[PDB]
Structure formats: C-alpha cells, structure tokens
Amino acid sequence: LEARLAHLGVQVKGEDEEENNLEVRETKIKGKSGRFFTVKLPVALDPGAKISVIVETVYTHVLHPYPTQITQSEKQ
C-alpha cells in the first residue's frame, strides 16, 4: 500500500486538535524495506510513560471492480 498512500496525518489525542497536529517527515531507516515516517512528539516521553496518538492515512485505487464488466441492470 505504500505506493497508493495519498496522504498521512498524525495528531495527538486532545481537545486542541488544531495544535495537536504533529510534524511528520519522510525518513528511511537503514536495513529495512518500505517507507517510514518520523514523528516529533510535542513533549519528550520519559521512561514508563504513555501517550495516545491518532494516525490517519488515505489510499487511492485500492478498490478494484469485480467483475470487470457489467450490464445496465447489473450492480457494481
């Protein structure tokens, strides 16, 4: 699905959605295939802490008609 990824957005789970959007940069991690993204947290996460984040992705062309051909009456 990496080729078909139209957009990626990350925001922290909080009331301040407008300000909770996180900066994301495309990154390549050595030795591992596939696209990766580096997300900068608003505050550093110290040992033993947790945070909740929401990741949204949109893919294009991932739905393929089957059967390929239909008549006027036939459904999709």
Binding site: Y66, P67, T68, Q69
Partner: protein, 367 residues
C-alpha cells in the same frame, strides 16, 4: 506454452465411462492436462464464475443425458466457445435434445434419435448382424496433416449417429465422411423418404474453426473412443477382406485431441514494419508512385515453443476498395518482406495479410 490451459472438465453420463475409456483418459492425462470428472446431471456444475472461466477445455461424454446439471446450458456452452475454449462432443443413438441443439448452433446437424449409420457392404464381421458397425476406410479421411497426423492409419471402427454439415456455413470441416454406400436411417423402418444423409454426404466426425479460433469437434460415436475399439482387430464381413491386427482408432483419436486443444497448427503474428526505402521510420503520408518496403514476422507453436513460421504461400495485398496489387511475401532473414511501387492513384490504402489455410489458425493483419 499451451494456448489453452490444462484445466479440463469432463462430463460423463455414467461413472463407468471412465473405466471403459481408461486408455483415452490416460493418454490425455500424460500430456499434462488436469482432468476433473463430474456427472453430467450433477447440480453443482458451473462454467463461469464472476465472469471468468473455471475451465479451459470441456469434454462432453454424456450422449444420453437430456439436460445438464446446474447452470450449464446450450447458451452457456455457446458463450464458452466464443471465449476461445475448446469443446469435444461425443454422440450415440441415444442422443438427447441438448446435443442436437448444440450441433445446430455450430452448423452440424445430428440425425433423429434411434437412427444409426447403415452400411451393408463394409460392416465388420464382428457386427451383431444389423450392419451398423461400419469399418471406415482411411480414404474418406480429410487430407489435412495437421488435424489428423502425418502418419498413416489403419481402418477405424465407427458405430453411431450420422450427421450432415450445413452447406451455408463455410467453417464446417468434413473430417471423416462415410462410405459411398453408407446412409443414415432407421434400420427397422423402410426407406420411404429420402435419407437424412446419403453417400459421402454422411459425416462421422466433423470439426469447426470459429472466427475467434475456438475449435470444437463432434463425433457421431462415443464408442469410437472406447477402449474396446482401440484394442479390437478389424476385418470386413465381405469376402476377400484382410484382417488387421489392430485398428487405427487409438492413433486417430490422439491426433484429433491435440488439434482440438491447440497443440498443433497455432500461429501468431508479430510486429509489422513499413517505411520508405532507405528510411528507418514510416512517413506520415507517402507520395504517389513512391517505393516502400513492407515487413512482417509470423511464428508457429511447436512443442510449446514459438519458432519462425515456415509458410511459403503468404500473400500481401494493397487495397483501397479492391486489391490494386497482390504479391507473395519473400522469406528473408527470418521475416517476410517485399518491396513494391505504390499505385499512381491517391487514397486511404490499407495493407492486408490474409493467410488462412486449412487446419491452421486464421491470421488477418491490416495497417
């Protein structure tokens, strides 16, 4: 690479047919076909799922079945042939209506039920005394090496219902005709009316080459493929007839099966190049009386590997409404090419190649 995939569906009126015809199925399986055996009446039978074909080849060894199970129907089989699938049909005196209807769509006319081919002069000595088991001479066999095999064949035994090819349909192939004395009629009932098939008009085996190149073979006799005929010796009842150790049924059956399943005679057309002489690219428009070079490449499928075609009779045409120029294409450098001067009349001309030969796939190219 086989033009038709190995997936084959076999329809049997009775399961016992597989045992009786073990030799034919084993020879087919040895060639890498993936056979699946289902009863012809079985409800689960289906050919098309979601617009795709479940099977590439269909063999209907179900002469007596009145109706097909599940969704299989004469319309469905017709669509399947249009898709390019190869179909084999075997008939008998018990022929049900669907088989006759299928022949009607293909232009091969089966005779009425209970009729049989009667030959009083060439019937085998082993016949029950009804003169319906006829020893078919190899002379009637069609003169097509690709379809029937180059090798010579011994006399073949046929017992079944005669069929007549429709004159109107050009594509019909008279693979095996009956003897001059043979005719199709009800044996018990006297011949008041004119026979449905008389003399050499009667057809025992016929083939069809569709415009899409689908191939279907109709056999009058299911028993012809039976193991019993394959091993049985043949001697004509009439006096002075030699006795042959083995029949030619097995060898002929193998050759026909190869032809139906696109194992022989398959041809493909590759890139065609035209340009002005001395030029490497085609001009947008040519001038009057200019000299141009035309090149095309054709291939043949041998043993599943494409190779340069050896055909020497290929003819090129330059046409506007009627053919202004026609000439043979020379075989040079693995390609067929010719150089000629354009006519003095301007217009929207088309280059045409129409190499259609008996038993081979029909090739048409237009630029």
């Amino acid at each position: 690479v086989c033009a038709s995939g190995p997936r084959t569906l076999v329809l049997l009126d009775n399961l016992n047919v597989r045992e009786t015809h073990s030799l034919f199925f084993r020879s087919l399986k040895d060639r890498g076909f993936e056979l699946t055996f289902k009863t012809a009446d079985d409800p689960s039978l289906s050919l098309i799922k979601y617009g795709e074909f479940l099977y590439d080849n269909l063999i209907i060894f179900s002469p007596s079945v009145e109706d097909f199970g599940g969704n299989i129907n004469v319309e469905t089989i017709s669509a399947f042939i249009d898709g390019g699938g190869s179909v084999l049909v075997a008939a008998s005196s018990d022929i049900g209506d669907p088989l006759r209807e299928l022949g009607s769509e293909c232009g091969i006319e089966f005779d009425e039920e209970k009729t049989a081919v009667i030959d009083h002069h060439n019937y085998d000595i082993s016949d029950l005394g009804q003169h319906t088991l006829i020893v078919a001479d190899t002379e009637n066999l069609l003169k097509a090496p690709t379809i029937v095999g180059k090798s010579s064949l011994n006399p073949i035994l046929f017992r079944g219902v005669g069929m007549v090819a429709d004159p109107d349909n050009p594509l019909v192939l008279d693979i095996l005709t009956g003897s001059s004395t043979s005719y199709s009629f009800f044996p018990d009932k006297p011949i008041t009316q004119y026979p449905h098939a008389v003399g050499k008009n009667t057809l025992l085996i016929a083939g069809l080459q569709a415009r899409n190149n689908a191939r279907v073979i109709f056999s009058g006799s299911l028993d012809f493929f039976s193991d019993s005929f394959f091993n049985s010796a043949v001697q004509k009842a009439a006096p002075g007839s030699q006795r042959y150790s083995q029949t030619g049924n097995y060898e002929l059956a193998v050759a026909l099966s190869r032809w139906v399943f696109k194992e022989e005679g398959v041809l493909r057309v590759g890139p065609v190049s035209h340009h002005r002489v001395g030029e490497t690219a085609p001009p947008n428009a040519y001038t009057v009386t200019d000299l141009v070079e035309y090149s095309i490449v054709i291939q043949q499928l041998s043993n599943g590997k494409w190779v340069p075609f050896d055909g020497d009779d290929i003819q090129l045409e330059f046409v506007r409404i009627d053919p202004f120029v026609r000439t043979f294409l020379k075989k040079k450098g693995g390609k067929y090419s010719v150089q000629f001067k354009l006519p003095d009349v301007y217009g929207v001309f088309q280059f045409k190649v129409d190499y259609n030969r008996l038993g081979y796939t029909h090739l048409y190219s237009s630029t």
